[PDB]
Design an enzyme around this catalytic site. Structure first.
Site, short mmCIF file in Angstrom:
data_model
loop_
_atom_site.label_atom_id
_atom_site.label_comp_id
_atom_site.label_asym_id
_atom_site.label_seq_id
_atom_site.Cartn_x
_atom_site.Cartn_y
_atom_site.Cartn_z
N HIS A 67 0.86 -1.34 -0.16
CA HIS A 67 0.04 0.14 -0.08
C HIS A 67 0.96 1.15 0.11
O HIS A 67 1.55 1.50 0.86
CB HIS A 67 -1.00 -0.01 1.15
CG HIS A 67 -2.06 0.91 0.83
ND1 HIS A 67 -2.06 2.40 1.07
CD2 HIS A 67 -3.35 0.80 0.50
CE1 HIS A 67 -2.94 2.96 0.85
NE2 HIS A 67 -3.93 1.93 0.56
N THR A 141 -8.08 19.76 -53.92
CA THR A 141 -9.40 19.13 -53.18
C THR A 141 -9.28 17.66 -53.81
O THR A 141 -9.19 17.41 -55.20
CB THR A 141 -10.54 19.52 -53.30
OG1 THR A 141 -10.74 19.82 -55.10
CG2 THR A 141 -10.50 21.03 -52.87
N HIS A 142 -9.58 16.72 -53.08
CA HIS A 142 -9.14 15.14 -53.25
C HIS A 142 -7.82 14.96 -53.84
O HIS A 142 -7.55 13.92 -54.65
CB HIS A 142 -10.16 14.84 -54.54
CG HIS A 142 -11.55 15.25 -53.94
ND1 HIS A 142 -12.56 14.39 -53.59
CD2 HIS A 142 -12.39 16.40 -54.25
CE1 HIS A 142 -13.72 14.81 -53.60
NE2 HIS A 142 -13.51 16.16 -53.76
N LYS A 269 18.69 11.25 -50.31
CA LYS A 269 17.38 11.52 -49.65
C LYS A 269 17.48 12.49 -48.66
O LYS A 269 18.18 12.98 -48.22
CB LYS A 269 16.90 10.20 -49.16
CG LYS A 269 16.55 9.15 -49.99
CD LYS A 269 15.58 9.44 -50.54
CE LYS A 269 14.19 8.61 -50.58
NZ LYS A 269 13.74 8.54 -49.22
N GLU A 276 6.66 13.07 -40.03
CA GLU A 276 6.39 11.59 -39.92
C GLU A 276 6.17 11.02 -38.47
O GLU A 276 5.42 10.51 -37.91
CB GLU A 276 7.16 10.55 -40.76
CG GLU A 276 7.17 11.20 -42.20
CD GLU A 276 8.21 10.55 -43.13
OE1 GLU A 276 9.27 10.71 -43.00
OE2 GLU A 276 8.07 9.43 -43.73
N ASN A 277 7.26 11.62 -37.62
CA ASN A 277 7.26 11.17 -35.99
C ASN A 277 6.19 11.78 -35.63
O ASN A 277 5.65 11.00 -34.57
CB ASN A 277 8.63 11.54 -35.54
CG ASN A 277 8.75 11.77 -34.06
OD1 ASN A 277 7.96 12.45 -33.49
ND2 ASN A 277 9.24 10.64 -33.73
N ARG A 311 -1.08 6.20 -14.45
CA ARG A 311 0.29 5.89 -14.24
C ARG A 311 1.06 5.69 -15.26
O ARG A 311 2.15 6.26 -15.81
CB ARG A 311 0.57 4.69 -13.39
CG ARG A 311 0.51 4.80 -11.90
CD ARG A 311 0.84 3.27 -11.24
NE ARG A 311 1.17 3.37 -9.87
CZ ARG A 311 0.13 3.34 -9.02
NH1 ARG A 311 -0.99 3.04 -9.47
NH2 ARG A 311 0.44 3.57 -7.59
#
Lengths: 434, 434, 434, 434
Positions: A67, A141-142, A269, A276-277, A311
């Site tokens: 407890h 749009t779309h 790249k 994305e994170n 918690r």
């Protein structure tokens, strides 16, 4: 945790910080009783001066008691320097009188940090929008070319969304800015109602008007839904950055530092990794929201099922949101914008974006809407499938060219027309100094 | 859906009502342009007087058009009474200027009904709380006897929860009480800003300060999270009724009607079926909240992914909540209370519920907390094990009876002590003196 | 983490353990290429012998690169003792060739632990069921007395549910027991398909038949849904323990240790705290499930949004489930059962549980069903509301007593009748040695 | 619900079909008792021949009964053609013996249809994959150009995902292909175990080895999670179509019909509307999965909370998935591919996609990885910044052209290299040679 935790927010959720809050609740409660005259001033002076805890002892005692709160108060009792007055620690209190009030106090702190993060993000958005007020680009749009807009208006949209979220946040922060010290089942049977008023006042909390053993978890469900909403707004904006950085499009790019490496195998790249994170974390926080709602139907005057869930989710949600607000605010602030690629892309669908205006002008010259639409549509579809300029096709089209002059046709193909109300929208949003 | 759907709410979600909303947005937009001087008053008078639609024809046209707003406006143009003025219908408008503005309009109607339901339910809880203000019963924590409370305080807790939910609902209703008529990508490029202002004001909507082709879906997510929160509050109360109706305790029973049958095989059954039903529907609505959150990250100036989802969740959530608020309010109103069972049950744990009062009195007489607790705990556990009254065990311990007079011991075992602040709570809640 | 993390499961999710798995993938990949003859045996011998990493350096390099895997391979390159052969580390690989294969290898380990926990829980359930095969008690439907059952049958239900879950788990574990080494976009363009076959074989994984940059996240969604299902089954059983420990009922109680303290203010308390804790964690894990599903729609040949979410949910879900299975298995194993309270409770609804049998016997004597039901129901409802014995009332009821003899009436009130197929059910489940 | 509902699936969920299922369970149960000898063959012959129901009468009776199974059996007893043998209908059965067994029966019918849909969709994906096996296009990671792949391999990835889903579906369909007829609390106290076996076998269901009053809802949760997983797989594919149809890239377009109109205001529009629609419905189904999981923790031998929830989610999920599988299969089947746009797009990043091939060849010639990478990265970034071809920059660096012949440099920039294992993947998948 832990690459997603900034130091400010992590620090409030430590065990040390929790037990300190418990101690403060306890001491304030004895100080309240002494104001009432129910326990001696001299006793509580000693409690305020000398009461403390050793965390390792709390944990040792908890091994026997199974407890938390009992372990804590028994550990406090063993403080070198407290005497008999230890008697009064937890007097009249139930466990969650301490735990819930302390938890609300910790959330108050978390929410001060989050409010500041949110205000800072709003400023970053406001600053970016003003920068690109007239940075023209395609509206989509779309996912398909519609009509021109500006990147400033896009950011102004985000700004206004986050202002809605600041207001929602204040309401959510408020619903959880409450403590209770009403005793075992919320009756005050063993604890004068003044004790709660005093403790809550001294922690910057309201006193719950009616409570059970606990605060009611509708509050925490409201709170988490707002946290999840803010995260989901951020995902919306991250998804946009990701889309605009696509290679065919490159209207925007996340800042790329000297020495950064975009991939392990492909040296060329440059990726929208921050955005994305943020997308990933928004998903985690929505999961916490579902958990929070499931915490509402507690049995009778309480069961403790919510505590093991809280918690996890209360530290994790607040830690993650603080991280998202700071990281994504820096992504937007440092974001590279490519006005030249934006203008170029407006070119790539053969002028088809002017189809509505050709149509509307036909209507002005007294054509019925479906007649105007159905003259213009095949011309548009021909341009798509043969990839020839739309203006050519309307010019070479004699039933338009009989109703509209050449300078009327030319006016239809002018994008400047679409900028006419940028300033008026910005004026509304507060983004001018006009 | 349809044993769970009341006519008041079902009526606002018919197709006919949608298309009526669409027509009115179109006519108001024409009327606005006429006030601007951009279309002849003469023409709009005829539009207002004669514009209509045939609903089977809308569907016919949509079969070819694969586009519902186009099918609608083409159907309006087939109105025999309309002449060339039909040219103006939808002038400068984008699909969703109509659909979103009309949707918000329909939602405003839905929300008027739900606010009424919420307010009726708050009143039902107030009456019931007042009736049972002094109906003594066990408070239970972790499902186990803690200390006495009253059924009225339990009902008062629901009352105040629903008051929090009413304020939440007013905020949520307001965030979706917004329209937009800003053209294809929100720029006003094709449609004077005044049209929007005119239309929204006439429908009792705010005008979005900035928009795209659609309203932003953070609004609808806030909204749905609040519907789910109300449902989940109702689940909590429903789970309590189900708990109290369990056979061992039978402190409450749902009203059982003449001619009602509780089960197919067991004629003796009387079940908390209403409450069980509410529990299931709350689960459904929480699912709709997740859906709504996933609708927020739309692409660029919009994608239509939210539409198919909203066609399910917006009618279904509002219909289900209206049903729940009405059905559960009746359950509470008509609920049977057994105060004699409540009193009987307080007897079943051998007076152990007064353990805290003995411990605290021992502290009053000079014992340290751990000493008092550890004198009292074994006697408590002895009573559990042995079926002897706690009071008798307390009276056999000389180190208690040396500090407490018989009077004082007798005070510990009085439940009236626990009703001393029922009135003070009720006064806070506003539940006093009628 | 961290009071909810057992050492076995926590250890597999450390950074150290992750980077070790990355190193093993890399070395195996070079060993595969050497088998192909594409890189020299002597080079790879050196890589197998000397390749290592310093974690602090990985983190330092990552500060510049903003890229985990590049930081890792560059750190490996700086190993004291590797020479030129470092050339071949990551040769042909893309980032997630390492990350996903290593992640699947770690999940393989987690799932070996979970499978063992699940099998152990099944044994605990089997052992408890056999113990209480004929421990008679009330069956309850809608929380209300129905007809007798046994606690062994209840546990046998749980046993069979967990066997269903062991089968589901094996399928889920299998869907994620796959690696990929197919290069930047899954084409094998830069990496011979044999490399993947070799690496996966040597890690106890299957090779994905077709992959992109990543493994497809339908697998991880299936996996998390199964984890959430197991947790939710455990919640179902925890909810039952909690209900049976309620004070009016006390058919069961969680083990309470010497020195344990049940509450801070109420010395008498013994609570189902373990079961309540399991309830909370099941909610958290269901939230992780929603996150996992949201990770499925990755863009094109991948986006990295899933990774930030998986960093949280994969360790947290597996850690929590391992904790739940072990803790709740010990709760059941050590659970106190009170057969005397179970038999006593069967008494408390005045024999009304025999109402079906009186009804069915009336039908046997040639009464129509609704006629039999409607004779019996008012008698049952009279007993409820006047709290007199049901058998008395049927005996004092002359239209039953004209069709049934006294020994027929007595047979209706015999509970032994309800035990007649316990053995036959147990025989099916495999819970006998008959 | 109802533009999203096909007749094949809508038909299995009508009330009439439910009650027909209920009747057949009742008659089969009577037939089983007759085979046992417990009720006269004569009587059951009449039951089988004449038992019926009027559906309006079921609803009439339910108004008084507030119990649908009782309303049903009382309505059956009003069948004019039935004599006293009506006595036997429902004999020894509990409400849910009928409802759950009939529900599983209806679900089996639904699942036959969904398996058929899944298999049709797998076939559509196979045809499309074969057609486009060598349709060269950019692979994209983080939305940015990585290396070449083929549209056929992208479709083959969907094919194999759907094969995983078919196996998942067969497991899920099987977990709910179960009935129960074990009486009030699952004990067989009132109903011989043979009845269940007889009934289930005649309906093509397994008999639950152990039950309560209901089947356990872990089954329906497994089942719903699999429906949601299929929907979410479809979302993933839908998001890809939407991405590839974006105007800058236009590698694919949904089929656009003669007479179709893409928008109300912009005649040039052609939108991925089908795909957008699938995305919204997947969101809805994921909500239904959460609901199903919350239905698992039923109390004791059952509560009826799951019922109201299942009335919504079971028909709605099965109807929506059947619609999605059919609609999206048609979208893919009829989808327009633009291989010339795909080739054009590979050109737009200046040949940077061959950066890995140059780096790896440099390693082949003796460079260490970090050296090769860091020679190539700046040239790559220079090309991004400067709009000059990567190949030209590579050819101007002497420390590259000293190690690579022109032949070798030219090999690096050939995309055919990237198709070298398309066939090897297709062979694994079973997609070769028709």
């Amino acid at each position: 945790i832990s690459r997603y935790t900034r130091p400010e927010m992590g620090a409030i959720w430590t065990e040390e910080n929790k037990f300190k809050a418990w101690l403060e609740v306890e001491i304030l409660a004895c100080e309240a009783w002494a104001e009432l005259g129910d326990i001696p001033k001299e006793d509580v002076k000693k409690i305020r001066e000398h009461a403390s805890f050793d965390i390792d002892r709390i944990y040792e005692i908890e091994k026997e008691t199974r407890h938390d709160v009992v372990a804590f108060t028994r550990a406090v009792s063993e403080t070198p320097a407290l005497g008999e007055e230890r008697k009064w620690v937890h007097y009249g209190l139930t466990s969650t009188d301490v735990v819930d009030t302390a938890l609300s106090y910790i959330l108050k702190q978390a929410n001060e940090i989050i409010l500041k993060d949110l205000e800072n993000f709003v400023s970053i958005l406001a600053n970016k929008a003003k920068e690109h007020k007239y940075t023209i680009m395609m509206g989509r749009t779309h996912g398909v070319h519609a009509e021109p807009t500006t990147f400033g208006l896009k950011l102004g949209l985000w700004y206004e969304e986050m202002k809605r979220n600041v207001e929602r946040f204040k309401q959510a922060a408020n619903t959880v800015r409450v403590g209770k010290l009403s005793g075992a089942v919320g009756t005050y049977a063993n604890i004068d109602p003044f004790v709660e008023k005093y403790v809550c006042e001294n922690l910057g909390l309201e006193a719950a008007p009616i409570s059970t053993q606990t605060l009611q978890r509708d509050r925490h469900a409201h709170y988490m839904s707002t946290l999840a909403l803010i995260a989901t707004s951020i995902e919306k904006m991250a998804v946009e950055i990701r889309g605009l950085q696509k290679s065919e499009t490159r209207e925007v790019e996340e800042a790329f530092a000297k020495g950064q490496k975009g991939s392990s195998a492909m040296p060329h790249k440059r990726n929208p990794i921050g955005s994305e994170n943020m997308t990933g974390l928004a998903r985690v926080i929505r999961g916490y929201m579902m958990t929070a709602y499931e915490n509402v139907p507690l049995w009778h005057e309480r069961d403790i099922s919510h505590s093991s869930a809280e918690r996890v989710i209360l530290p994790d949600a607040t830690i993650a949101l603080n991280y998202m607000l700071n990281r994504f605010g820096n992504i937007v602030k440092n974001l590279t914008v490519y006005p030249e690629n934006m203008k170029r892309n407006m070119t790539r669908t053969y002028g088809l974006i002017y189809s509505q205006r050709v149509m509307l002008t036909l209507i002005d010259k007294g054509m019925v809407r479906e007649e105007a639409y159905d003259i213009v549509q095949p011309k548009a579809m021909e341009a798509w499938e043969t990839q020839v300029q739309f203006k050519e096709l309307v010019e070479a089209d004699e039933r338009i060219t009989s109703k509209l002059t050449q300078e009327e046709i030319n006016e239809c193909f002018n994008y400047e027309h679409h900028m006419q109300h940028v300033d008026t929208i910005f004026e509304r949003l507060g983004l001018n100094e006009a």
